[PDB]
Design a protein around this ligand. Structure first.
Ligand SMILES: CCCCCCCCCCCCCCCCCC(=O)OC[C@H](COP(=O)([O-])OCC[N+](C)(C)C)OC(=O)CCCCCCCCCCCCCCCCC
Ligand SMILES: CCCCCCCCCCCCCCCCCC(=O)OC[C@H](COP(=O)(O)OCCN)OC(=O)CCCCCCCCCCCCCCCCC
Ligand SMILES: CCCCCCCCCCCCCCCCCC(=O)OC[C@H](COP(=O)(O)OCCN)OC(=O)CCCCCCCCCCCCCCCCC
Ligand SMILES: CCCCCCCCCCCCCCCCCC(=O)OC[C@H](COP(=O)(O)OCCN)OC(=O)CCCCCCCCCCCCCCCCC
Ligand SMILES: CCCCCCCCCCCCCCCCCC(=O)OC[C@H](COP(=O)(O)OCCN)OC(=O)CCCCCCCCCCCCCCCCC
Ligand code: FES
Lengths: 229, 89, 223, 40, 248, 168, 62, 154, 102, 60, 149, 146, 50, 53
């Protein structure tokens, strides 16, 4: 069943009838994986070796957000309060590396540190900050513009208007690094030119009827994202 | 200019009223353009937004002639007067 | 005068990019004309070594880099230094320097912050004979020689770890903090633990050497 | 926000280090880790 | 019919003359353009598969697993039973010590399983669930155990049957977790005893995870020709109408 | 070209008020600015079209060899006075200026009071000097004096400093 | 290379100070290199495209 | 589900060929078909102008149609007929022939309005098992029909 | 036939019920052909009757303006906005025709 | 034929082909198999449309 | 200027050579060339066919192939039979357009609107009062498209 | 809010505002909302049928949801988010804004004296366990089907 | 403020007070008939008595 | 679920609508009882239809 030489991993995978959608100037690292009903806004960065599953429920992610390296984002399926169990992420949201996100709502301009565990039914309000190593208990509300820390997260203090501006500026600074990463890639993948010819590649076992090609009218389409299939 | 050449001041006044009212009618929508965040109004294809290049180039040409069409208006006026000179001959 | 050389280099790079793109486009057109679909293969685009324009990762032949790993930008590696499976070192902003005989675990993510205060290096510096456990996150930190960091530890910007100190697993070093030499510290708000002994230091050094030897054996088996 | 670099190359910033000494020893089980730079 | 004869002639010329010539020219141009911009550029590679890696005499035996993610890394003495699932980005290092995975056991995304000591075995029983971003080293996890996301299980940990460790918990070294007890905290302490509806909730959580693993295994094992067919089908479905769906 | 250069100044000003102002009330203030300034420009345009059509020339010199009757001179002087007084704010038309100064960014407010309004004084002067007008200027003088009196009487009841500077 | 050089003969404070100074110097060198590359990226378009733009404007106007 | 792009392409091609026929045109300024049509410079220039503008609009439509196919082949066949017949409205010489050409083109426009897409595949899953009334199609047809009636009788 | 300002209301409903491409093509067909022929009726085809035409046109123009200077300010639909743009431009061009025939 | 990691003999045949391929009606016009297919098609159209065939063809 | 010789395969190119941008001449204006048959009938134009009209047809046959291919590039959800039939239809349409162009060329030569190998006994003297194109054409390719600049 | 250092986070369950709904088909629904939000946003997040919401709440600068209504606001734009509020809560809502009343009385479907536009409602504490009814709203334009 | 802006604003609002935003069929037919009949009346009145 | 849009399958149940959508009682009766109606039950919808008529 296993033992192939060349990896079969696909960055963007669509479970049947659940297709991901990505906005413009958004960079998903080829090491990362996105499965299912995941919608991602414009100028959004998903860094390397991250998993985003929208299989049992949808995932919606805003525009100017950054997702760190070893981040798992997935949904639950149901909530005790009867609210929708989909993951909702605001517009300028920073998620640090080694963080887990499970069926929660996070409002705009929220910073989550490195090593956090956000559990099901949690509601983080606009402008909130969670320190590096913290766990948000399920079904907990974090007030807007507040700083929290601890494994059972405890209140620290309010955040001044200088801190929120700094967080927004930090969110805005991730665009050009991702743009450089994108510029390192060419629209045409050359990995197929380094493979040998197999028996099945030259002689298919069965043939299918012609239909519309998946890249019909591609010459008139701007190659905005070089990582497109 | 042509109305003034033909000595029709009442027509000029009514066109002025129409022009100012229509100008406000048009520029009223510039207030509605303000949005909290980016709109995300693009179609998706192959998991990614579909940005058309040919329509983009057409808009580029139309934008050039909208911005700087006043410089080349003399040639269009020449051609249109040449066409219109055939009406009676 | 060096601006002239930079201009020439950029022009040459752009011409090469043009030539490569034209060749790939011609090959795709040949695909279509031939009723070929090989160039429609959706293979992985992941690159083990990803150099930004002038920032090219640099390492010795004795270094082990897992094919799962990703070194991006200016990443400098010393001799007999191993990077684990799935680790990411992003030096697109600022360089990442790693000494020799240093082991980096599997899920370690190393990056740098944009700007810091005066007198504080913004890059990441890792000394010699340093062990970093799996699942660690490092940002703009200085780690001296013979320092062990346990698994699932987070070290933030401006942190300094002196020589011979040990960080217990599942810990956090707050930003801009000094951890003195020859001490053990634990906790998320990391707290002081009793000073190290000779036996503990010897065991840590032996474990680091054994991990380096196992990494070398794995590299030899991979080739 | 400002984005300029502060570690300049034209000259060295005038500073002293005797002020704000670090502790580095005699720690308890509850206090925080000492600071790093301390130069003024 | 001359028009059809001309149409047929052109296709053969395009397939046999123009096509190969364009392909050769394009390949040569792509090869020469990559050398120009060295060493300031990189090319697409063939990413190796780390599903089955054998070192010395450590041969993995994972043919009975229901799902192994193509992104996962499995090295050394790793033995899995029937119906097992290893999800995306998971690392299993049996070279440092043998790893045993029981029936219907689910190991979620980005989970590390590696013994700290050189001669320690990590054994995980049947119907066990381990959540994403978890770390496991030299542990004895019994049947029907639950380990939450972002949890650490240390080198001396023995979890009894039906033992629950809450999400974001670090179980200290040399800890025995008794049956039907929920433990939580940065240092793990005995929190509570389980309640039967909580047991039921965990049971359907494990069952839905197993079925999700089955669905993901079905999805991720498609060949190249099936992926192109799926792409074309998705585009067509975007292009279909109500009458087309009714006709289907 | 004189009229075209006078007309060219509107788009950059509106763009600056629209995209650079931090206050939320500046969105409607830009619309007010545009609509009043363009009404004035329309009046000036009518006068310019009158002059161009009657005398098929584009030089200030040629106007020395053509005479305008009393009716045409009166129409032209009224049109240019009202049109240039829309921008250089005469008494009944300064609501746009007050709103725009209150809501606009400080730098553009400096540019608008310091220089932009002066563009109306120049052009008017030119068109005032090139034509022979045989009307009594008492109505225009009264309008200007009413502007002065109305603006200066409103300075006491201002608490916003920027509005006070606008009235000055 | 200060980092690769053996520093066990020094006190930890001296070692960390030496590492910090070396890192700062290398950071300054890298900053200078990146800045000159970006300066070249600015300079090239001016030389390449200033004359065609002026030609376009001159042909349009006079 | 046929993509009508080729149909639009066909239109362009044929329309372009018509341009060619004008470019190489020769003759006298006169009337033809019992003085029912006029051939002079101004009428032919109006004909050429409408052709070239129709061709530009068709080219942009062909570019747009590949982003999302929400139109049928009959839609662009109606467009084909309209673009084939309107310049002959420019070439009219009596009110009689102008009236008949205008009814022909009005019927073509009615045909275009009829073949508008009514139902769409969207993400609204709350409207199953309930009746929602749109009424936009009926209003368009009704008002176009009665305006055409009044204009024609007068 | 043209849905001009006195009788412009049904054009709003027609635009409301139509797709954007239909409005595209309808606008080009309306301005290029219908309105141009309507103009050439007074300018070229029936110029001998201008001594009867002008006054009629004048009246209509006035009515149209006084009918739409307030109605165009209580709309809340994109299609209605486009249709009223076309209507306003039609009124302006009719005033230009009145100027031309003098 | 690998040339600097690039294979110049890369070839993957397309499995998406028309069902209509290799049909008798797609043979060159005038062939015996094409004539057989055309004869079968013409008779089928006449049987369904007798009056239409009569009108159009006889009138022409 | 010099025009392509008639009754030759390149005669149709004379359709692209003009003296003025006018579509048609005035009611009483003389055609540039002597008239062979002013009130021609359908068979009069057909009998006037020669190598130039056949060259127009041949050019239509040559250029129809890329145009038909370009049209065919827009097909989806099609079979081989439908594709071949549509290609044949488009090609036949282009052939018909070429035949129409040849018929018009023959009619023009009959009427004397284009070069038919005859010259008027008396040349119509014209004074080039307004001249914006003579030197521009003489320093360009457009001297080929103009007759008597 | 009001918190002290070391305090634990409150529960989302205790902050839920409950809305009771009678559907277009005569069935009963229970919906969770939060303070500071509009009724339209809660209804659309909970996927409640019967509302069309053609204009999607109106403009973004001078909205009807700000506690003092700004004079130069434009008001609602489509009047297709109508709900019927029961007597106590509707009485506490107060008199309608003149623009909202103009849009309400101008709709193509019949309305009531308790009719109220959803995007013009800001959810408050006193709206807990409020009873509303949503008969089907009219369609306006061609794009409503798309 | 009032005499320059709000006069026009209130005029537009009060005029729109008497306008149906949605066209009904009877109003459409009545508008067409009224236009015909009273354009004819005003033209004949200008011709005869003016 | 294959060929069912966003409809999800839970434990003991296939599911009949998209997540967070209201369950319809009439369709429940249709699915459970194919053609069996013990009595003409007067629900709110039936009374509303009567009032509308
Ligand atoms: C593939 C299917 C195609 C369509 C088939 C169904 C449609 C059939 C249409 C009618 C065909 C039969 C026509 C019979 C009469 C002509 C016979 C014929 O070819 O005669 C040759 C003869 C050729 O000879 P001649 O015209 O040069 O001269 C007559 C003979 N002498 C010299 C004695 C005077 O006539 C013609 O070709 C005349 C063609 C006239 C065409 C008139 C078109 C008017 C269009 C008005 C459009 C208004 C809008
Ligand atoms: C706003 C849009 C304005 C458009 C321009 C037209 C404005 C109205 C012009 C009216 C006009 O021209 O009336 C003609 C009349 C001619 O007067 P006449 O008798 O010939 O000689 C004066 C000696 N009694 O003229 C007069 O009697 C005087 C005309 C000028 C009156 C003052 C300015 C009015 C506003 C301009
Ligand atoms: C105004 C731009 C020049 C500013 C002055 C200048 O060149 O400063 C030097 C600067 C390098 O700075 P540094 O070396 O750190 O400091 C030395 C201080 N003189 O030098 C630089 O930064 C060099 C790059 C300057 C900015 C780009 C070049 C701008 C002008 C390009 C004109 C090219 C010609 C165009 C017309 C002809 C086209 C054919
Ligand atoms: C009057 C009919 C004129 C056309 C036919 C003339 C007679 C003829 O050629 O008949 C022979 C031909 C085939 O020969 P047969 O003996 O029928 O069959 C043995 C061959 N395998 O038989 C045929 O071709 C069949 C002719 C059928 C005539 C039907 C008349 C009414 C409809 C006419 C439609 C025009 C097209 C007919 C053919 C359609 C395709 C089959
Ligand atoms: C490298 C260099 C080597 C040397 C140079 C070599 C050059 C070789 C290629 C050039 C010569 C090729 C042959 C000639 C060009 C092809 C034909 C062509 O473009 O014709 C333009 C057309 C001709 O019409 P005209 O001649 O007036 O017809 C009347 C009687 N013959 O004219 C017209 O249609 C008349 C104008 C129509 C109306 C225009 C004005 C109104 C519209 C203005 C705005 C348009 C906006 C877009 C509209 C839609 C169209 C895109
Ligand atoms: S959603 Fe349009 S008025 Fe409320």
């Amino acid at each position: 069943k296993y033992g192939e030489n060349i990896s079969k991993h696909r960055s963007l995978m669509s479970l049947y009838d659940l297709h991901p959608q990505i906005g413009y100037q958004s960079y998903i690292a080829p090491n990362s994986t996105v499965i299912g009903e995941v919608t991602i806004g414009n100028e959004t960065t998903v860094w390397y070796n991250s998993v985003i599953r929208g299989d049992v429920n949808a995932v919606q992610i805003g525009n100017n957000v950054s997702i760190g390296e070893n981040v798992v984002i997935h949904t639950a399926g149901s909530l005790p309060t009867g609210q929708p169990a989909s993951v909702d992420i605001g517009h300028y949201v920073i998620i640090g590396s080694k963080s887990t996100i499970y069926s929660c709502t996070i409002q705009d301009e929220v910073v989550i540190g490195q090593g956090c565990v956000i559990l099901e039914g949690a509601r983080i309000e606009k402008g909130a900050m969670i320190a590096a190593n913290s766990v948000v208990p399920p079904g907990r509300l974090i007030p807007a513009g507040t700083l929290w820390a601890g494994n059972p997260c405890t209140f620290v203090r309010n955040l001044t208007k200088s801190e929120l501006a700094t967080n927004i500026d930090h969110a805005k600074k991730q665009l050009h690094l991702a743009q450089q990463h994108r510029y390192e890639y060419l629209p045409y993948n050359s990995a197929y030119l380094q493979k040998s010819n197999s028996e099945e590649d030259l002689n298919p076992t069965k043939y299918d009827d012609v239909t519309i090609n998946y890249n019909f009218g591609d010459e008139e389409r701007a190659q905005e994202n070089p990582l497109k299939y | 200019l042509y109305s003034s050449f033909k000595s029709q001041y009442l027509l000029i006044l009514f066109m002025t009223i129409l022009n100012i009212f229509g100008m406000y009618f048009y520029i009223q929508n510039l207030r509605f353009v303000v949005k909290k965040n980016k709109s995300s109004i693009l179609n998706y294809k192959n998991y990614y937004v579909n940005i058309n290049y040919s329509i983009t180039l057409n808009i580029i040409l139309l934008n050039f002639f909208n911005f700087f069409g006043i410089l080349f208006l003399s040639d269009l006026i020449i051609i249109l007067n040449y066409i219109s000179s055939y009406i009676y001959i | 005068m060096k601006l002239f050389q930079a201009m020439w280099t950029r022009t040459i790079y752009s011409i090469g990019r043009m030539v490569r793109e034209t060749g790939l486009a011609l090959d795709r057109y040949g695909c279509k004309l031939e009723q070929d679909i090989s160039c429609y293969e959706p293979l992985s685009r992941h690159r083990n070594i990803l150099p930004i324009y002038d920032l090219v990762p640099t390492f010795y032949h004795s270094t082990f880099i897992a094919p799962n790993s990703s070194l991006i930008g200016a990443v400098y590696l010393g001799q007999n230094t191993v990077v684990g499976y799935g680790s990411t070192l992003r030096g697109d902003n600022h360089a990442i320097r790693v000494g020799h005989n240093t082991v980096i675990g599997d899920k370690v993510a190393i990056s740098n912050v944009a700007t810091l205060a005066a007198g504080i290096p913004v890059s990441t510096n890792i000394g010699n004979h340093v062990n970093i456990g799996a699942g660690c996150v490092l940002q703009s930190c200085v780690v001296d020689d013979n320092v062990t960091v346990g698994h699932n530890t987070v070290i933030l910007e401006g942190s300094v770890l002196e020589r011979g100190s040990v960080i217990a697993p599942n810990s956090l070093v707050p930003a801009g903090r000094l951890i003195p030499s020859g001490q053990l510290w634990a906790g998320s708000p990391v707290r002081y633990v009793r000073d190290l002994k000779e036996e503990e230091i010897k065991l840590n050094l032996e474990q680091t050497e054994q991990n380096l030897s196992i990494g070398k054996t794995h590299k030899s088996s991979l080739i | 926000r400002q984005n300029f670099a502060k570690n300049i190359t034209t000259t060295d910033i005038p500073k002293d280090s005797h002020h704000f000494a670090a502790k580095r020893s005699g720690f308890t089980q509850t206090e925080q880790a000492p600071f790093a730079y301390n130069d003024v | 019919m001359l028009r059809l004869r001309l149409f047929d002639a052109y296709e053969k010329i395009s397939m046999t003359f123009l096509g190969p010539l364009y392909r050769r020219i394009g390949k040569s141009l792509a090869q020469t353009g990559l050398n120009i911009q060295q060493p300031y550029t990189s090319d697409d590679r063939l990413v190796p598969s780390l599903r089955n890696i054998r070192v010395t005499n450590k041969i993995p035996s994972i043919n009975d697993s229901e799902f192994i993610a193509p992104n996962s890394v499995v090295i050394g003495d790793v033995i899995t039973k029937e119906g097992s699932s290893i999800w995306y980005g998971a690392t299993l290092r049996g070279e440092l010590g043998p790893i045993e995975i029981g029936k219907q056991t689910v190991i979620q995304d980005l989970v590390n399983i590696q013994s700290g000591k050189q001669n320690q075995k990590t054994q995980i029983g049947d119907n066990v669930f381990i959540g994403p971003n978890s770390y496991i080293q030299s542990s004895k996890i019994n049947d029907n155990s639950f380990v939450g996301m972002g949890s650490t299980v240390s080198t001396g940990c023995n979890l009894a049957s039906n033992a629950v460790v809450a999400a974001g918990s670090v179980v200290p070294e040399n800890t025995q977790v008794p049956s039907n007890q929920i433990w939580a905290g940065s240092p793990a302490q005995y929190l509570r005893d389980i309640t039967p509806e909580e047991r039921q909730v965990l049971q359907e959580h494990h069952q839905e995870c197993v079925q999700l693993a089955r669905i993901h295994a079905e999805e991720t094992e498609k060949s190249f020709r099936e992926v192109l067919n799926d792409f074309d089908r998705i585009t067509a479905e975007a292009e279909y109408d109500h009458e087309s769906l009714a006709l289907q | 070209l004189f009229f075209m250069c006078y007309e060219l100044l509107l788009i950059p000003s509106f763009l600056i008020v629209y995209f650079v102002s931090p206050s939320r009330r500046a969105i409607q203030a830009s619309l007010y600015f545009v609509i009043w300034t363009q009404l004035g420009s329309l009046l000036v345009l009518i006068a310019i079209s009158y002059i161009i059509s009657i005398t098929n020339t584009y030089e200030f010199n040629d106007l020395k060899y053509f005479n305008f009757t009393n009716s045409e001179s009166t129409i032209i002087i009224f049109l240019i006075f009202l049109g240039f007084g829309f921008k250089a704010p005469i008494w009944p038309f300064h609501y746009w200026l007050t709103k725009t100064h209150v809501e606009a960014p400080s730098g553009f407010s400096i540019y608008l009071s310091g220089f932009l309004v002066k563009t109306a004084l120049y052009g008017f002067y030119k068109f005032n000097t090139s034509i022979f007008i045989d009307i009594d200027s008492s109505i225009f003088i009264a309008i200007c004096i009413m502007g002065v009196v109305d603006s200066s009487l409103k300075m006491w009841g201002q608490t916003d400093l920027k509005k006070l500077v606008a009235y000055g | 290379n200060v980092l690769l050089s053996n520093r066990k003969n020094l006190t930890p404070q001296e070692s960390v100070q030496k590492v910090i100074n070396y890192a700062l110097l290398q950071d300054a060198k890298q900053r200078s290199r990146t800045l000159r590359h970006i300066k070249a990226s600015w300079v090239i378009p001016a030389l390449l495209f200033t004359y065609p733009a002026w030609y376009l404007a001159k042909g349009a106007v006079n | 589900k046929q993509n009508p792009s080729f149909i639009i392409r066909l239109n362009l091609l044929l329309n372009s060929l018509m341009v060619l026929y004008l470019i190489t045109f020769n003759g006298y300024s006169s009337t033809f078909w019992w003085s029912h049509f006029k051939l002079n410079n101004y009428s032919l220039y109006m004909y050429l102008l409408v052709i070239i503008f129709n061709n530009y609009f068709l080219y942009i439509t062909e570019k747009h149609i590949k982003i999302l196919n929400n139109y049928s082949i009959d839609y662009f066949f109606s467009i084909i007929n309209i673009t084939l017949f309107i310049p002959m409205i420019f070439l009219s010489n009596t009110l009689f022939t102008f009236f008949f050409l205008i009814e022909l083109v009005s019927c073509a426009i009615f045909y275009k309005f009829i073949v508008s897409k009514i139902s769409f595949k969207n993400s609204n899953y709350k409207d199953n098992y309930f009746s929602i009334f749109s009424k936009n199609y009926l209003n368009v047809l009704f008002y176009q029909y009665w305006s055409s009636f009044f204009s024609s009788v007068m | 036939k043209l849905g001009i300002a006195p009788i412009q209301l049904y054009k709003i409903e027609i635009y409301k019920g139509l797709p954007f491409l239909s409005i595209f093509f309808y606008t080009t067909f309306y301005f290029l052909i219908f309105f141009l022929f309507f103009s050439l009726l007074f300018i070229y085809y029936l110029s001998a009757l201008n001594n009867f035409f002008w006054i009629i046109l004048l009246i209509i123009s006035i009515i149209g303006i006084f009918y739409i200077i307030s109605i165009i300010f209580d709309i809340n639909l994109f299609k209605a906005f486009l249709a009223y743009s076309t209507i306003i431009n039609s009124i302006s061009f009719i005033l230009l025709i009145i100027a031309i025939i003098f | 034929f690998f040339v600097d990691k690039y294979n110049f003999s890369r070839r993957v045949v397309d499995h998406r082909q028309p069902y209509d391929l290799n049909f008798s009606i797609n043979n060159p016009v005038g062939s015996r198999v094409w004539f057989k297919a055309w004869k079968q098609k013409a008779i089928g159209n006449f049987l369904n449309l007798v009056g239409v065939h009569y009108a159009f063809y006889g009138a022409g | 200027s010099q025009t392509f010789a008639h009754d030759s395969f390149l005669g149709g190119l004379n359709l692209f050579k003009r003296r003025d941008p006018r579509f048609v001449l005035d009611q009483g204006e003389r055609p540039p060339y002597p008239i062979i048959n002013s009130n021609s009938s359908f068979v009069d134009v057909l009998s006037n066919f020669n190598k130039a009209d056949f060259g127009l047809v041949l050019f239509s046959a040559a250029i129809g192939f890329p145009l038909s291919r370009w049209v065919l590039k827009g097909l989806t959800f099609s079979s081989l039979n439908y594709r071949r039939g549509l290609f044949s239809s488009v090609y036949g349409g282009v052939i018909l357009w070429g035949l129409v162009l040849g018929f018009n060329n023959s009619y023009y030569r009959l009427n004397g609107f284009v070069d038919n190998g005859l010259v008027w006994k008396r040349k119509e003297r014209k004074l080039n009062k307004y001249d914006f194109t003579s030197e521009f054409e003489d320093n360009s390719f457009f001297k080929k498209l103009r007759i008597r600049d | 809010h009001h918190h002290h250092a070391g305090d634990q986070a409150d529960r989302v369950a205790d902050k839920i505002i409950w809305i009771n709904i009678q559907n277009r088909i005569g069935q009963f629904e229970r919906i969770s909302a939060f303070e500071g939000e509009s009724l339209l946003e809660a209804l659309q997040r909970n996927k409640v049928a019967g509302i069309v919401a053609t204009c999607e709440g109106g403009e973004d600068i001078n909205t009807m949801l700000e506690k003092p209504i700004d004079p130069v606001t434009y008001g609602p734009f489509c009047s297709s988010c109508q709900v019927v509020v029961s007597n106590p809560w509707r009485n506490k809502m107060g008199n309608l804004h003149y623009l909202e009343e103009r849009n309400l009385v101008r709709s193509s479907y019949p309305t009531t004296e308790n009719s109220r536009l959803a995007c013009c409602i800001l959810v408050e504490k006193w709206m807990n366990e409020m009873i509303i009814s949503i008969p089907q709203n009219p369609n306006s334009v061609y794009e409503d089907n798309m | 403020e009032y005499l320059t802006k709000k006069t026009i604003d209130s005029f537009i609002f009060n005029n729109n007070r008497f306008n149906f935003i949605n066209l009904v069929e009877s109003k459409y037919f009545l508008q067409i008939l009224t236009l015909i009949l009273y354009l004819f009346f005003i033209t004949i009145f200008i011709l005869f008595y003016i | 679920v294959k060929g069912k849009g966003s409809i999800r399958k839970g434990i003991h149940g296939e599911g009949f609508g998209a997540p967070s959508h209201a369950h319809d009682a009439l369709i429940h009766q249709i699915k459970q009882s194919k053609d069996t109606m013990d009595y003409q039950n007067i629900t709110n919808e039936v009374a509303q239809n009567f009032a509308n008529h």
